[PDB]
Design a protein around this ligand. Structure first.
Ligand SMILES: Cc1cc2c3c(c1C)C(C)(C)C[C@@H](O)N3c1c(nc(O)[nH]c1=O)N2C[C@H](O)[C@H](O)[C@H](O)COP(=O)(O)O
Ligand SMILES: Cc1cc2c3c(c1C)C(C)(C)C[C@@H](O)N3c1c(nc(O)[nH]c1=O)N2C[C@H](O)[C@H](O)[C@H](O)COP(=O)(O)O
Ligand SMILES: [K+]
Ligand SMILES: [K+]
Ligand SMILES: [K+]
Ligand SMILES: [K+]
Ligand SMILES: [Mn+2]
Ligand SMILES: [Mn+2]
Lengths: 496, 496
């Protein structure tokens, strides 16, 4: 099958790209695999495939780290993401985000049920597995559990059957047949869990599929709208119906080529300790445990020689930046456009630890609105910060047409030189806040509310008559013929 | 003579370092020399020495561009600055700033008058030069004049003779025997000019020396205290009295080895058009001229084969970032310490276009103060923003002991993840503002007041009991033996 539709083929694509290191000697899942992976992420090296994981028993399991991290080159920087989506490895972030947005005005292509698939090659019942005996990684030294779930897809369905949600939320091993993890508002897993809690009759039928189709894990990490089944959106984006098989112990459906599938329930009544965990913003607060969601596992099915993907998340750059940040920015871009705001592009600068989104403004359109910074700031902020897709984002930076928002250096320059602190910003204190940002959940204020800002880096004439400067750079402060002469003579004169 | 005491020897040091390209074919001072220099600055290439400048007549003049810009390597990144100060080329920013601060608690070493020097090898009276006939560069295409003065040192003395100030302020050619330029508060050239204006009897005796001792041009770009003669501070820092010769037409004294010296007066009554100019923040606003200071030139003296240094300033990275930003940060560091604030280090991140200063806090000391963020923010802000040394800086970022403020990536991470917008910041609206920042002089508010902020990126426990996190990075989230094993096995496993 194609790499974007089959995790095993995606692994073979990374090998063929020379973007994989296969480590066939024993590696310890207690910190070592994640430490290697962490180093890869901090240095944009090749993805590690741990074929010989101390503790692997009866085919459970190998580990692929850094599945959505960056490559060293500028030319194929986003190649690993492109391989999730059947895009060329040289694809730009604009092209990747466009691809992820493309299904938003297509009819869904619902999944196809098939009788069986590779995820059924092996199975373990209630009496044959113990989750504490599998080689689940300890990802960071102070983590409060072994985080089995960093790159699988939780699958839950509304009680009425009309919406089936696929998402990534973390989970750790609690005991032999339970996980715990984060199920928090406004996330769809939480929205669905609320539905089942209000019905009050049963625990939520659940499955967790690891090593799913790469196009599916990307949609899993994207805040597509409420009520939209991710399977049909992936189908539309890929132009192909995804093949799913039914779970053995419940009536949910999992991708046929899933590497590892857990089947069971998410409790509407029980909780258990989760955390702390070394998280996307680059921190772990040791000892910081909180009661979370509790999942019971009834059954494990898996492929022969199953591979568990893993995110060793933290400081720059990993899946939590490349996927959470970029995919939220993509949804925000569309959200603004649908609210008649003249936004052309959006990206979450890595330099901001993906807590900022930069919004590129079509200033011709802005000038026709005949508005002001204060007015426009408030309007953008109300649209974004009151919507789920702005959940993780605490600062919006508005920039004109000259700035490439996919270039953090240019975003920083515009922010630093065009936005007057205070005067050019509007604070938003009565919006939902992202408590995982340390200044929120470990900060001076309410963990779940406020701390958000819109920073206007549009200059005054951008609202009226048009840009009235040229940059003092090589590109803009010298005529074209001169620039060309200088470039043509550069090595001749003696430069690098 | 030594490179830090003689510009001609500094040029020969850059050659010997393989940090110079000598361009011996004709180069046009109308944009081409500055366009080459601009490209060098944007790419951290070797400094260009234009030995064959179209228009050079009777030894006036060659041009050295990018004299204080960055080298490509990390190891000798600041090598060109180190060569200003007799430091090893591998010196750190901490070492350079320490050197620049070292004279602050030394007795001055006043200059030594000598009868003559190289700057007297050639001279031109009132009837033998015309400033419009020299090969003065047009640095950016929309500049409002040919900026002769981008890296020379203005020399003015208080009417009572007790304080002789050396500083860099821009100036452009106005006519055959006059320059115009910026003389603005709170700069010492302005403070002295005010003294002469209030006496009301004569224009200010003035000289402008280009290609001065490299240690002198660094002090020229530093906001050392009011009333302190830069010559004696340089003497103390270098451990040697600087040799000066008297001007021919006035009683000021210039460095003996100055490449080019203009002698004349700064008017207490006349103004003339200055600007626009492509400036440190990365912008030029074409057409934006304002009346500035007017200088009359009575005499030119110069070395045989004189060399004019030039800053082609604008977007990152040039002298306006490496020198204005870093040297203000150095003075701010000391200012805080003298006000009993527990600041260990200060730097102006290049990513902020040197409009921010990051202040590293000794948090052991902070905890003994038993204070709060709001209190501490206000106190730091009042000390810095009400003092000349904070003039150019609009945002202060307070960070704990784990952050290296000389690393912009770590400053950005701390700012983005530890400072809650609004709640963790104090705005300062009744302080002098830096009008050259586009959001000030071309912004929505008063050009000369406010727009400043203190952003507290100290976490709450840093004020009380101590840091309560570990970073989720390779360094902090894995024990030492593991990290070493991983590094030892890195290339063996197959990584880069
Ligand atoms: C790619 C990726 C995304 C997420 C996470 C991770 C990765 C790697 C972890 C490594 C496990 C870290 C963890 O903090 N994590 C995570 C999470 N969302 C949660 O509610 N809870 C979580 O613990 N998201 C983000 C969500 O996947 C997106 O917000 C998505 O939009 C949700 O889907 P939906 O609710 O919109 O359907
Ligand atoms: C290194 C350097 C410093 C400065 C400048 C330049 C360079 C290269 C220009 C390229 C010419 C750009 C110009 O904007 N410029 C400049 C200037 N100060 C001014 O009042 N006016 C100016 O036009 N400074 C900064 C001052 O040199 C420092 O603020 C110094 O502290 C002043 O000395 P003092 O008043 O403290 O004695
Ligand atoms: K999703
Ligand atoms: K603005
Ligand atoms: K000075
Ligand atoms: K803070
Ligand atoms: Mn969803
Ligand atoms: Mn001074």
């Amino acid at each position: 099958q194609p790499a974007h539709l089959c995790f095993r083929s995606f692994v073979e694509a990374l090998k063929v790209d020379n973007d994989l290191v296969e480590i066939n000697t024993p590696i310890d899942p207690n910190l070592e695999a994640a430490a290697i992976t962490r180093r890869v992420c901090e240095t944009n090296d090749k993805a590690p495939l741990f074929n010989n994981l101390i503790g692997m028993k009866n085919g459970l399991f190998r580990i692929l780290g850094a599945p959505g991290s960056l490559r060293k080159s500028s030319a194929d920087r986003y190649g690993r993401l492109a391989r999730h989506l059947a895009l060329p490895p040289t694809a730009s972030m604009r092209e990747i985000l466009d691809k992820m947005l493309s299904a938003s005005d297509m009819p869904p292509i619902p999944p196809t049920i098939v009788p069986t698939g590779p995820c059924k090659e092996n199975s373990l019942d209630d009496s044959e597995f113990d989750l504490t005996e599998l080689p689940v990684p300890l990802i960071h030294k102070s983590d409060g559990g072994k985080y089995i779930q960093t790159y699988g897809m939780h699958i839950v369905q509304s009680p009425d059957g009309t919406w089936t949600n696929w998402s990534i939320a973390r989970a750790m091993v609690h005991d032999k047949n339970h996980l715990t993890g984060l199920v928090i508002p406004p996330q769809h897993i939480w929205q669905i869990h609320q539905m089942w809690k209000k019905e009050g009759r049963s625990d939520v039928p659940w499955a967790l599929a690891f090593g799913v189709p790469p196009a599916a894990i990307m949609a899993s990490s994207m805040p597509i709208p409420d009520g939209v089944t991710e399977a049909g959106y992936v189908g539309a984006m890929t132009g192909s119906s995804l093949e799913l098989v039914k779970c053995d112990t419940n009536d949910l459906y999992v991708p046929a080529t899933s590497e590892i599938v857990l089947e069971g329930t998410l409790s509407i009544s029980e909780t258990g300790p989760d955390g702390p965990f070394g998280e996307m913003h680059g921190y772990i607060f040791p000892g910081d445990t909180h009661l979370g969601a509790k999942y019971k596992v009834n059954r494990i099915t898996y492929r022969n020689n199953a591979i568990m993907p893993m995110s060793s998340c933290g400081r720059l750059t990993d899946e939590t930046h490349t996927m959470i940040g970029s995919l939220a920015a993509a949804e925000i871009r569309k959200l603004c456009q649908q609210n008649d705001l003249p936004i052309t592009d959006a990206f979450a600068p890595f330099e901001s630890q993906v807590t900022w989104v930069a919004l590129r403004v079509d200033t011709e359109k802005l000038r026709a609105m005949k508005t002001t910074s204060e007015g426009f700031r408030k309007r953008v902020g109300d649209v974004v910060f009151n919507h789920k897709a702005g959940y993780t984002i605490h600062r919006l930076v508005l920039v004109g047409d000259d700035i490439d928002v996919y270039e953090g250096k240019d975003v920083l320059w515009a922010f630093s030189t065009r936005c007057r602190p205070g005067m050019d910003e509007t604070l938003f204190e009565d919006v939902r806040g992202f408590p995982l940002i340390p200044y929120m959940g470990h900060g001076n204020g309410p963990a779940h509310r406020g701390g958000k800002v819109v920073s206007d880096a549009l200059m005054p004439t951008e609202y009226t008559t048009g840009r009235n400067w040229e940059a003092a750079d090589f590109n803009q402060s010298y005529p074209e013929d001169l620039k060309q002469k200088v470039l043509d003579n550069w090595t001749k004169m003696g430069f690098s």
